[PDB]
Every structure is written in C-alpha cells, then in structure tokens.
Amino acid sequence: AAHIGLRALADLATPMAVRVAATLRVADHIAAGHRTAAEIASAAGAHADSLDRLLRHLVAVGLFTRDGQGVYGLTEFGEQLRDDHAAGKRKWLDMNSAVGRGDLGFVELAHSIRTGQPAYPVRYGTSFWEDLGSDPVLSASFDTLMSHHLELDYTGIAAKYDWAALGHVVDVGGGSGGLLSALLTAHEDLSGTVLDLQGPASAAHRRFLDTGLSGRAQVVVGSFFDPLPAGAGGYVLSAVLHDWDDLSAVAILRRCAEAAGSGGVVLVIEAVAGAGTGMDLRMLTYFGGKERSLAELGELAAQAGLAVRAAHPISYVSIVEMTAL
Amino acid sequence: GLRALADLATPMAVRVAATLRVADHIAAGHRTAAEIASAAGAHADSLDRLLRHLVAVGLFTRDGQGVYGLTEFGEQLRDDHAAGKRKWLDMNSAVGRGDLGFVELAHSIRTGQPAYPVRYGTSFWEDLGSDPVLSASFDTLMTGIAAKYDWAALGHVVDVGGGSGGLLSALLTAHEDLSGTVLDLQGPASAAHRRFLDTGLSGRAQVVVGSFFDPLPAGAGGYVLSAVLHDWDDLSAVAILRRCAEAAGSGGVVLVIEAGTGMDLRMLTYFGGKAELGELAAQAGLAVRAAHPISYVSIVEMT
Numbered sequence: 261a262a263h264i265g266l267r268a269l270a271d272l273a274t275p276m277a278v279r280v281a282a283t284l285r286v287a288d289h290i291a292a293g294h295r296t297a298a299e300i301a302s303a304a305g306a307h308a309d310s311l312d313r314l315l316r317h318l319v320a321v322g323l324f325t326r327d328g329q330g331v332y333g334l335t336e337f338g339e340q341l342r343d344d345h346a347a348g349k350r351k352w353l354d355m356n357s358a359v360g361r362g363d364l365g366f367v368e369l370a371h372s373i374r375t376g377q378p379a380y381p382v383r384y385g386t387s388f389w390e391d392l393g394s395d396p397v398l399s400a401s402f403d404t405l406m407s408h409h410l411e412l413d414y415t416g417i418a419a420k421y422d423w424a425a426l427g428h429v430v431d432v433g434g435g436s437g438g439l440l441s442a443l444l445t446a447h448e449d450l451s452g453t454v455l456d457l458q459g460p461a462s463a464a465h466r467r468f469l470d471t472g473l474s475g476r477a478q479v480v481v482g483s484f485f486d487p488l489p490a491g492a493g494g495y496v497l498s499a500v501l502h503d504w505d506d507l508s509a510v511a512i513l514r515r516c517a518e519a520a521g522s523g524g525v526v527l528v529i530e531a532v533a534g535a536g537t538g539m540d541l542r543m544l545t546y547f548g549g550k551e552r553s554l555a556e557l558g559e560l561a562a563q564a565g566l567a568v569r570a571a572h573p574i575s576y577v578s579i580v581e582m583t584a585l
Numbered sequence: 586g587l588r589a590l591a592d593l594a595t596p597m598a599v600r601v602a603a604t605l606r607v608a609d610h611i612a613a614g615h616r617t618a619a620e621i622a623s624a625a626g627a628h629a630d631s632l633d634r635l636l637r638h639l640v641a642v643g644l645f646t647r648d649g650q651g652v653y654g655l656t657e658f659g660e661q662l663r664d665d666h667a668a669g670k671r672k673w674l675d676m677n678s679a680v681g682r683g684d685l686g687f688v689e690l691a692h693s694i695r696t697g698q699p700a701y702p703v704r705y706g707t708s709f710w711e712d713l714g715s716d717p718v719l720s721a722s723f724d725t726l727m728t729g730i731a732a733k734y735d736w737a738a739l740g741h742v743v744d745v746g747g748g749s750g751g752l753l754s755a756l757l758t759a760h761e762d763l764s765g766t767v768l769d770l771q772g773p774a775s776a777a778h779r780r781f782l783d784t785g786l787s788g789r790a791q792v793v794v795g796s797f798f799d800p801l802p803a804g805a806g807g808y809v810l811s812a813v814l815h816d817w818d819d820l821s822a823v824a825i826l827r828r829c830a831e832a833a834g835s836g837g838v839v840l841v842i843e844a845g846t847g848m849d850l851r852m853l854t855y856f857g858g859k860a861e862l863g864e865l866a867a868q869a870g871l872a873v874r875a876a877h878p879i880s881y882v883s884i885v886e887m888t
C-alpha cells in the first residue's frame with residue numbers, strides 16, 4: 261500500500277467527491293436520462309458549474325464518461341453508485357445514511373487521538389445513538405445497514421451453536437430482531453426477547469408480528485446498563501461491545517452475568533481482533549468504542565465475574581462463550 | 586473498490602499523524618506509544634491505535650517490543666524531509682487546514698459557495714492574511730510573462746493582491762527602471778517586505794497593507810492582478826475591478842492576468858471561485874482592449 265504516495269494516501273478530494281455524488285444520486289439521474297451537468301443539477305438540486313467540476317473529477321477517477329458534447333454516462337464501475345445496484349454500496353456512502361453521516365466524523369479524528377473520546381459529537385453536537393433516537397430516517401438507515409451485516413457474517417448462524425439448549429435467549433442490544441428472528445425460525449421450541457431502545461425494539465416487535473413470531477418472541481424497551489430480564493439460558497451481545505469503551509463494556513457484561521447467574525451463558529458475537537485497524541478507528545470515532553482481541557475480551561469478562569469457555573469462528577466474526585467465573 | 590475509494594479513515598489518520606508530527610518524535614527518540622503521546626500531547630491508548638493503522642498502511646514499523654520506527658515512506662512525514670509533504674497534511678499548515686474543508690464539499694456543489702467557511706466560520710484569505718506563518722506555508726507550498734508585455738511603459742505598477750514578492754519582483758528585475766507596490770493583506774505583505782528587502786528592491790519595490798475592495802492607492806500607470814480573478818465570483822471580481830478603474834481612470838491600464846481536477850475541487854472548496862468574462866468586467870467596469878496569450882496563462886489588458 262506504500263506504492264501510492266503520501267499525498268495521494270491523504271487525499272480527501274476523491275473520497276468526498278464520491279460521497280457527494282452518492283448523496284446527490286448522480287448515477288441514478290444520468291441513468292434516468294439526465295445526462296448533462298445542467299440536467300443533473302436541476303434534477304439533484306445543485307449548482308451546474310460546481311457539479312460539472314465534481315463530475316470531471318469523477319470521470320478522471322473512472323466512474324463516469326463524458327463525451328465531447330458534455331453528455332455524461334456511467335462506466336461499469338460507476339454503475340455501483342446506483343441505488344438499485346446489487347452490491348448496495350450507494351447506501352453506505354450517502355451522507356443521509358447513518359454510516360454515511362457518521363464517517364464524516366473522521367474529519368475530527370484529531371480530537372479522538374488527543375482525548376480517546378468519540379469524534380462524532382465534535383461534528384454533530386450529540387452522540388450517535390442520541391441522533392438515531394431522534395431521527396427515524398437515521399435509525400431505520402442504521403437498521404438496514406445492520407441487516408446487511410447480519411447477512412454477510414450470520415448466514416447459517418443457527419447451526420454454529422447449540423441454540424436449542426438455551427430454551428430462552430435474550431438478545432441484548434438486539435436491534436430490530438433480525439438475529440433472534442433467524443434463531444427462532446430454525447429452532448421452533450426456542451423462545452427469546454429483544455432488549456433495545458424504543459426505536460429498534462419497535463421495529464423488532466413489528467418484525468415478529470409480521471413473520472408470526474410474536475408468540476415465541478417478545479420485546480423489552482430498556483437500557484442494557486440497567487438490570488436485564490433475568491432467568492434466561494443465554495444472553496447474546498451481537499456487535500455491541502465494540503461500540504463501547506472498557507468501562508461501559510464491563511458495565512454491560514456485568515448486567516449480563518447478573519441476569520445469567522450460574523446457570524446461563526453469555527455469548528459475545530463480533531469480529532475479534534483476529535475487520536482490523538480500519539473498523540477499530542471507526543469504532544473510536546463513532547463511540548469511543550474499540551475492536552478487541554479474544555484476550556482483551558477475557559480481561560473484560562473477568563471484571564464482570566465471567567470467564568471465556570470457548571470461541572467459535574463462524575465467518576468474519578466469532579461467537580465467544582462466557583459463563584459464571 | 587468503491588467503498589475503498591471513499592475511505593476517510595486512512596487520509597485523516599495520515600493527517601493526524603503529520604499534525605502530531607509522530608515521525609519527527611520517533612526520529613527524535615520517542616518510539617513508544619506512551620513516549621510519542623507524551624511528546625505530542627496525545628492520549629497514549631488512542632495514539633497507539635492510530636499508529637497500528639498506519640503500520641498496516643506502510644508508513645510505520647512496529648516491533649514485538651512495542652517500539653515504533655519509520656519506513657522509507659514514513660520518512661516523508663518528517664517536517665525535515667526534502668519533499669516537504671508534512672506541510673500539505675499538517676492541520677496547522679495552510680493546505681492541511683483548508684483541506685479538511687472538503688468535508689463540507691456538498692455545500693459547494695449545491696450552491697457554488699466555498700466549503701471552507703462552513704467549517705471554520707471565517708474565509709480562507711482572512712486567516713492567511715492574519716498569520717504570516719500560515720501564509721508562508723501556503724506560498725512555499727505553491728517569468729517570461731514580463732518579457733511578453735510592455736510593463737516599462739506603465740512607469741509604476743500596483744500589483745493588486747500581489748501576495749508576497751512574486752511577479753513584481755520579476756517585473757522589476759526585468760525592467761530596472763520600473764517601480765512597483767504590492768497591495769495585499771498583512772500576512773502576505775510581511776513576506777513581500779522581507780523579499781523585496783533581501784532581493785535588494787527596497788528602492789523600487791514597496792508594500793501597502795490594505796483590501797483591494799476599498800479605495801486603492803491611485804496614480805500607478807497600471808494595476809495588475811494575477812491568480813486573483815478566479816479566487817472570486819463574478820461580482821467580487823467586477824467589484825475589485827471597479828477599484829482598479831477608479832484608480833486607473835483610462836489614464837492607466839487595469840491588467841487582468843490568469844491542471845489538476847483535484848486541485849480544481851480544492852479551489853472550489855477554498856474560494857468558491859473557478860475573455861467575455863474580462864468583458865463582463867469591461868461591462869460593469871474598465872473596458873477590455875486586448876489579450877496576450879503566454880503559454881498557458883494570458884494577460885487581459887484594459888483601460
């Protein structure tokens with residue numbers, strides 16, 4: 261990766277140009293017939309002269325084509341910007357999407373490096389969760405993005421662990437219930453509850469009504485820093501811990517160990533340090549969170565009165581099993 | 586990849602490192618996360634996470650002891666390095682600072698206005714004009730034109746927005762009997778002072794600190810402005826031209842002299858700027874009378 265050049269590696273022009281085009285849905289406009297800078301500008305609500313400059317830059321990058329008459333077109337590479345593209349990439353870049361909005365926080369990375377605190381608040385004046393809690397567009401956006409994450413690393417998850425033996429599973433920070441949905445469908449005698457904030461919890465309850473699972477699945481609006489529904493055989497922490505600093509992480513794990521007691525299990529499911537540095541920084545900038553190794557996970561577990569008993573690889577992520585220490 | 590082309594993590598990681606001058610500290614002897622963070626005044630745990638990302642990028646080396654080192658490429662982060670890249674990335678540096686303005690690029694695309702103000706609340710030229718350091722960083726980080734026009738006939742020429750010594754120094758050097766004055770903001774003008782001073786042009790070269798938007802120093806046989814046109818919107822320009830006119834009065838000629846798609850977007854981000862144009866200047870101001878193309882850059886004379 262050293263074969264690029266210091267400056268080029270630090271370039272912000274191209275990444276932002278791509279993000280602006282994704283946001284302005286430029287690719288969809290030209291595919292719809294709006295081909296000139298003027299046509300695309302009036303269609304996307306932009307300034308023709310300025311938009312043209314951004315298009316020229318993106319042509320140089322190879323996403324678009326421009327003939328001698330100023331008529332633009334999509335290259336096979338540019339087709340990826342279309343909102344209907346099968347790879348679903350435009351969504352991650354749109355500044356209106358949860359992650360598209362959040363990645364701009366990297367502009368304030370110096371603050372996180374100097375303080376260890378999240379950069380997202382320095383840019384938007386509030387926490388990521390608070391923002392999603394106030395805006396259903398952002399919340400729904402983040403949920404959709406997570407569903408995409410579930411597909412990639414969770415397919416066949418029901419077969420990678422003995423979920424049936426749990427009897428009842430509590431998904432702590434379970435989102436809209438996509439994971440619990442997959443588990444209950446495969447294991448018909450299993451029951452479970454989604455514990456999350458109003459937003460996701462409501463979406464999950466809506467999901468259960470829709471797929472006819474409300475009978476075995478329920479929802480609990482609550483904070484995982486507070487006492488959790490006790491008595492369950494297992495508590496799942498799916499892509500949650502990396503969102504928090506050590507202090508908060510142990511707080512969450514501690515509430516899980518509490519609820520699980522001597523008889524239950526706590527399952528942390530996420531990419532152990534074994535994504536990498538890139539996601540780690542994203543976690544730091546967004547929430548002051550972090551990617552951890554199985555060892556760091558063990559250190560956190562001990563502090564909550566828990567112990568790692570096993571770690572099951574399932575894809576890009578792993579399932580780490582913990583029980584009363 | 587597309588999501589890769591849009592990555593912001595690595596570019597900012599690079600810029601934060603340059604700003605904290607991690608490479609310099611390392612070369613100085615601080616090779617541990619805690620030691621670098623101590624020298625750079627950062628949070629050790631967080632700094633270590635940034636360095637690990639840069640190790641994977643190929644700028645830094647890290648041994649199983651926790652000691653960090655610089656790779657061939659990492660050497661370029663040295664504020665001492667010959668290529669002088671550090672200046673382009675240091676958030677304290679002219680372009681290292683304005684570049685973060687790219688995060689507001691959407692504003693420029695939707696309106697045509699500079700993004701920089703949306704981030705910093707002040708304009709780019711305002712800040713540079715207020716800090717001779719910041720100013721000098723942008724200039725260093727950036728001839729025959731005289732042998733192409735009859736400057737000598739002007740007698741005295743006011744380089745409007747003449748930045749630092751620049752063109753006037755070359756004009757006065759090509760015409761040993763011409764005199765000139767650089768009109769610009771405090772920042773650039775200071776530099777213009779040191780230059781003309783060392784270049785022994787004290788006798789025929791002078792500097793006046795002021796805005797080219799209010800009454801200008803009249804008299805001069807000609808008022809020249811290069812690389813000052815695009816930095817502004819039409820109005821701004823004609824607004825500036827009006828000043829030259831009121832100081833030229835067709836007794837003098839107002840001259841207007843004028844590669845990188847990424848550089849083009851930087852200009853849009855920084856200034857929201859960019860012959861019928863100079864004519865649009867002729868319309869609401871001094872009338873065009875010629876144009877003389879030199880290489881890439883032309884010279885549109887008025888009066």
Ligand SMILES: Nc1ncnc2c1ncn2[C@@H]1O[C@H](CSCC[C@H](N)C(=O)O)[C@@H](O)[C@H]1O
Binds near residue numbers: 389439455460482
């Ligand atoms: N204090 C809190 N209490 C409960 N849930 C919270 C919370 N703060 C954040 N969350 C939830 O933690 C989740 C992290 S991201 C989604 C995780 C989900 N298990 C999945 O795999 O998709 C989000 O749903 C967020 O709403």
Ligand SMILES: Nc1ncnc2c1ncn2[C@@H]1O[C@H](CSCC[C@H](N)C(=O)O)[C@@H](O)[C@H]1O
Binds near residue numbers: 713714810
């Ligand atoms: N309001 C203002 N009044 C005077 N000079 C200004 C100004 N705003 C910007 N400038 C100057 O305009 C110049 C733009 S950079 C181009 C400089 C030009 N090529 C030259 O002859 O040196 C900078 O020096 C900037 O400081």
